[PDB]
Amino acid sequence: SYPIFTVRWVAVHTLAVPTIFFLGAIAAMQFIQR
Amino acid sequence: MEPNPNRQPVELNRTSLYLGLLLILVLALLFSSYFFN
Amino acid sequence: TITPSLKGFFIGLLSGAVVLGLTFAVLIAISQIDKVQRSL
Amino acid sequence: METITYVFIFACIIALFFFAIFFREPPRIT
Amino acid sequence: DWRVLVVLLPVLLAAGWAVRNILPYAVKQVQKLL
Amino acid sequence: GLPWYRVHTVLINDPGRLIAAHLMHTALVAGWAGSMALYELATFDPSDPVLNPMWRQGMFVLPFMARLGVTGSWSGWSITGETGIDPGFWSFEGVALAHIVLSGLLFLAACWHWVYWDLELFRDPRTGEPALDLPKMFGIHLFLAGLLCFGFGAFHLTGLFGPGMWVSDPYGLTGSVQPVAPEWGPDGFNPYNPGGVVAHHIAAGIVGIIAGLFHILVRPPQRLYKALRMGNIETVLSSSIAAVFFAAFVVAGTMWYGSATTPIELFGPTRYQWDSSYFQQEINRRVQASLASGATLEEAWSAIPEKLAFYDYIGNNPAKGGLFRTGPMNKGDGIAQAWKGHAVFRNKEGEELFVRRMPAFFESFPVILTDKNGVVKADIPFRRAESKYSFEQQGVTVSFYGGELNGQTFTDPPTVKSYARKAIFGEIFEFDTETLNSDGIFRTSPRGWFTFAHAVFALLFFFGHIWHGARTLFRDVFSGIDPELSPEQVEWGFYQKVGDVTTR
Amino acid sequence: RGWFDILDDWLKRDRFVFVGWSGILLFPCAYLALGGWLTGTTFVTSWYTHGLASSYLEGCNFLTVAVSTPANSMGHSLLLLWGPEAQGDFTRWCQLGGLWTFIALHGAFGLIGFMLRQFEIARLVGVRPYNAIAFSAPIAVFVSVFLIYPLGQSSWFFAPSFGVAAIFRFLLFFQGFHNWTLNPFHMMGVAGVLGGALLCAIHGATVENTLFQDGEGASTFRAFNPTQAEETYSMVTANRFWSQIFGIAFSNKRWLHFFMLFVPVTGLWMSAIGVVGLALNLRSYDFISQEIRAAEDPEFETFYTKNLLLNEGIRAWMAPQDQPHENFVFPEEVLPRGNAL
Amino acid sequence: NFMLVFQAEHNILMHPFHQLGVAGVFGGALFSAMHGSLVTSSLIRETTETESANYGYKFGQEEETYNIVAAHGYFGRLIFQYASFNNSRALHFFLAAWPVIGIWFTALGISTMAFNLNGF
Amino acid sequence: MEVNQLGLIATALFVLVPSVFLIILYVQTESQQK
Amino acid sequence: MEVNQLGLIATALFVLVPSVFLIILYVQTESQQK
Amino acid sequence: EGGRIPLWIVATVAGMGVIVIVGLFFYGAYAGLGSSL
Amino acid sequence: TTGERPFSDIITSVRYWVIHSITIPALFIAGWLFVSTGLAYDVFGTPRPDSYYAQEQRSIPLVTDRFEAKQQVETFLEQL
Amino acid sequence: ARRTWLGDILRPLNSEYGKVAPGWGTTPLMAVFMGLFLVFLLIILEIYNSTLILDGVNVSWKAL
Ligand code: CLA
Ligand code: CLA
Ligand code: CLA
Ligand SMILES: CC1=C(/C=C/C(C)=C/C=C/C(C)=C/C=C/C=C(C)/C=C/C=C(C)/C=C/C2=C(C)CCCC2(C)C)C(C)(C)CCC1
Ligand SMILES: CC1=C(/C=C/C(C)=C/C=C/C(C)=C/C=C/C=C(C)/C=C/C=C(C)/C=C/C2=C(C)CCCC2(C)C)C(C)(C)CCC1
Ligand SMILES: CCCCCCCS[C@@H]1O[C@H](CO)[C@@H](O)[C@H](O)[C@H]1O
Ligand SMILES: [Ca+2]
Ligand SMILES: [Fe+2]
Ligand SMILES: [Mg+2]
What we know:
part of a larger assembly, 13 chains, A: mainly alpha, 0% strand, D: mainly alpha, binds chlorophyll A, photosynthesis,electron transport, photosynthesis, electron transport, Cytochrome b559 subunit beta, Photosystem II reaction center protein L
């Protein structure tokens, strides 16, 4: 029925993929002690 | 001379007069302090 | 002579040409594969 | 001289308000 | 660095667990456009 | 009728009256140049290019005449300080007169072209409609521009047939008009190399001639003619405005940073020469060389030219002014009269102390003195009750070397503090503050004012470009969109390609 | 036919995210500017350029992270990754502030791409390009503040740093050093911004409170059809209301909506001109007549002289840490202070 | 003077209610320019090129004077379709609510820093 | 107060010149045939 | 020369005000229906 | 394919995930780096 | 109405969540490890909490040389 | 319209309004010159900016 890899698909993942990676990084930072 | 066919009448309606005078007068009220310095 | 910064200038020039060339190569290829349909 | 100038411009604005309200182009439905 | 492979191995296994679950429509929809 | 902001659109389809309006604009600009030069000659004091040069006096067009070789007055003086010179006709006054006469002649031509607007030349021979063949006009004008550019470089700037251009040493002490040979190597692209200015006009001129011939002889490709609307004179307005705001940003930049075409004896020093202590370093170098050769301290500092010391003073920094602080720099700190000499501060132990100089950012700045390693040794306190570093506590004195005060030492704390306040500005000068009723507040130089106006106008002309480019490409909808606009062209899914009805 | 026209076809396909020829410039530059900011605020320090922590990694929060400007010693270097400062070393490039020029320059070209997008789409859809024209005001602000201002100053160091608190610092810097509130070009900017917000509110409220009853619902949003010919609210009633409340009112809807563009667009353009002046320290800092009087008369005091004392406090108290390259050491006896505080 | 002393004593710049105020007036100015430009962009042709387009609207006429489907077709492609208003009533409610709510919060910022609950 | 001596004429012409421009244009609009 | 400081604005307004009055009257005469 | 997981459950679970992660970030304002302690 | 599958279809389908129950946590954990291994510090040159200062000097390692700035941060870092 | 001596001489220079070369014509050559010009501007910018530093090219007042 529908195509699955589109320009929209690319635009969505160029933003969403780093966002999740970054959120995992920033969550880890909450446990860093000086 | 034969008339120029490109001439056009010009207009400024009353609201535009009031708007323009307000702009000028308020700009003057604003910049006058800096002109006097 | 070719100074370090002239070498660097060339690296930047080549890098930009590669980015633009690959971008247009990819866009041109996709545009040819997936053409708009028009009535005759 | 500066005070006269400031008050003059202000007074012209107040006069302009009066004409712009009471001597506006009347809105007309056509 | 060893940490580079430690960080990217999750992303490596994720991209492999999503292609093998959409491959019947990745090369498929590619073959339908031609 | 036409709204007030459109009155000049009556010229769009009237080439003769457009030419007349352009002639009138040209007459007004040339008349401004002549008027401005006469006003400057009526106010310029030529008696001291050392401490009262043109850029201290608010001169704006005088440096442009001097840049290209006009340096003398019919009254016998020259801007480098000579007497009994004969400039011939092309004095500052002769330039001004030539611009006034040109203005009158352009005015008369404008009258003729306004009255006799309906020339057969302006009509398309096929249709009889008014028509300008803009692609070929561009070739003709580009060829002419290239010839003129080439000739300026090959004859005027080289001195082969003309005077040359203003050139100077790196510290702006001995500037004069000289023939300049073109620089054909890579240092021709150094903004500070005048030979590159010469090579540019030769090479760009030839390129303009060649490209001009190309544009006379070869018609635009149909695809570019259509895309850029080359039948519409407003496309030329759009792209011309763009070229002009580019050029305006460039001249603003080279004026602010300095180049071979913005010399400091004509426009004043740059802010960056203060930021980097450019003149202080050269002064210290000369003094140290004098000392190494066996000079005394008074002799070493007395060998410093007052012109060099004067550049090492923040009152000549163009980043010290104000937007509504009007007029010449002399209206602020005063008309500079003489160098007071170099102030050396010492504490009671005899250690030499250095006043921290004011950065351009600061309208006001404290007085703090350090030793050679930057350790604070004295200051002028605000609160006194816990003062530890006052000039009174530290026994600060000041001795002068060179200038008016050479050989003198001051020990009275108020006097020492007054000189310390001046030392935050760099080298210390005596000023005449009475002649102009100077107010003691810093103003910028022609370098600053030129840069301000041209950066501002450049940014404003970006809007003009956007506006007229839009008018060109959207001429069909200038009065509104199609009253029967197909809703399928703006709704999603009807057409595969946005706005193309052939795509279903 | 022709590869150019075939490419033009594909670029202009009606899709969820329109691409266009402008998209070739816009999307990489916008993505890199935003990605650079997120990267820097998450991971990158300002220790070597400013002596400041500035990332989540170091412990900052959303209000205090920034991508900070390079050190003053960098001047106006483009600071290209392959340039003579970083020499291709990515780590050193981040430590030198290379992400600031990366973001500023990709941001500039992305804004160009966005305004080209506004032109391109307007042309394809058949509307006049006023939205692009209005966007010239954001561009004028960005270019004057992030490029022209530092280019007039000693270095990129004094441009705004890309962060919430960093921008607040920029505001207070402009107060203390430039007396920027006194500047009539900033004042016109303020009038255009607050006037634009006023027009936004009053027009939205007026339309919503002169609606015709076009349905039976007490919630009135469903009683509108995008294709309907009729105005959804009464201009005649709106005009009488404001005429009687305020003395004047709009009567022409086309003028009204042009004016809503004109006011904020003109205000931002005016603020940009003032900032171009501040690039050269060409400030509206003082009124000379005020200073002559105050200098001679120690009983003469105005709010203008009061604010300059505040500015002098800002400069003396903020400069040593805000301008570390100057190595300012101000012994505390020289600091300006009123009584007790 | 009031603004500078307020910042010294309350750090209002670091207070989220003033930040909402800024979003309110920056956003209000943005949305004024956006709305003005979108309506102006889609005015229906009723005049010649020598007339102000404003004469194409007559006070009290019943027909709308611009094509909101054209405007939405533009703005929905500028961003994406569902980021654009097709409902004029929703749009004008948004124009009212955004600056009004932002100004409410910034007024509450001043009114609560009045009791010395200050910025972060 | 020691104000700029050209401030008065600067302000006067700043008001008068554009105001007069507008008045000329307005009055000659009113005198056009109705 | 130590001239009267109001001489300039006096002369400017003396010229400007009556000249503007005439220009207004002339232009609105020209614009009347011929 | 689509529709098997009701949209209100997706919205609720996603929204809860946002609250958790933002809550974690506020916790970190009081502990470790950036806590002032 | 531009032909792509509606987002509401996608994010309510089990296939979407089969894929993204793997890919979203993998990305999150990779980001976590990028920090927890300390790799983020070394990629970007960000000081660890013990690396802003040496024990005796309490001065900022400010870059003061444009063209040897790179080597200068190297010197400042070897001073820790 | 009015013919003049000078207008008759210039007539052929304003007689080809609307004339075009077919299709793309010299657009490819034009693009090459545009690209070269972009590289030229980038060179002179980077020299002025001290991003590109050349032997014998001292961008300063000193050693002009
Ligand atoms: C490129 C333009 C330019 C530049 C850079 C200069 C530069 C200079 N001029 Mg020259 N001059 C010029 C054009 C220029 N001039 C023109 C066109 C004239 C004819 C009027 C003159 C006549 C002239 C005289 C008679 C004198 C000078 C003098 C000087 C020197 C002092 C400048 C000064 O104090 O400015 C002050 C600048 C300002 C106060 C800035 C004004 C900003 C305006 C008011 C803003 C307006 C905003 C607008 C209303 C906003 C509208 C908003 C709306 C759209 C919504 C300086 C070297 C002086 C000198 O020293 O001579 C030796 C001097 O006596 N000039
Ligand atoms: C080469 C430069 C140039 C030229 C030849 C034009 C020509 C034109 N413009 Mg464009 N424009 C330009 C640059 C230029 N513009 C720039 C820099 C901007 C941004 C400021 C604009 C913004 C602009 C807009 C928004 C509009 C035009 C319009 C027009 C057309 C009508 C002009 C008119 O009747 O005004 C009549 C002007 C007056 C009766 C008085 C103007 C008074 C000014 C504002 C104050 C003082 C000006 C002072 C004397 C100027 C000294 C200039 C010097 C400092 C450079 C005409 C084709 C109009 C158009 O498109 O019509 C279809 C239009 O709406 N222009
Ligand atoms: C359109 C997209 C776009 C644009 C406009 C830019 C623009 C820029 N980038 Mg970015 N970048 C992009 C995409 C883009 N980038 C992408 C996709 C990536 C990821 C790979 C990057 C990664 C990146 C990094 C890591 C950096 C930049 C940097 C820069 C800046 C310097 C670039 C430079 O000097 O190139 C020079 C090269 C060109 C201009 C290429 C021109 C090619 C010419 C025209 C061909 C010449 C051929 C000739 C005419 C043929 C003659 C033939 C004849 C003789 C027969 C500049 C702002 C630098 C920066 O921001 O530093 C602060 C930087 O460090 N970019
Ligand atoms: C006819 C004739 C003649 C004569 C002539 C003449 C005598 C001329 C003159 C001329 C002139 C004598 C001219 C003048 C001009 C001027 C101008 C044109 C100016 C302008 C200005 C402006 C435009 C300004 C502006 C401004 C202001 C005001 C303020 C600030 C800002 C600005 C800068 C913007 C003769 C015998 C030779 C012969 C032939 C015939
Ligand atoms: C720089 C650079 C680059 C690039 C990079 C990139 C492209 C990146 C991207 C990145 C990214 C793309 C990232 C992202 C991130 C994200 C995040 C981090 C987010 C967060 C969010 C949040 C946190 C949220 C919040 C909120 C809001 C906002 C509102 C609502 C509510 C809440 C609270 C939820 C390259 C390599 C080229 C080169 C070198 C340099
Ligand atoms: C005790 C105060 C007097 C000692 C000398 C003061 C420093 S020098 C003094 O400074 C004035 C301001 O620049 C100049 O106008 C003047 O020419 C100069 O004599
Ligand atoms: Ca006096
Ligand atoms: Fe509206
Ligand atoms: Mg923490």
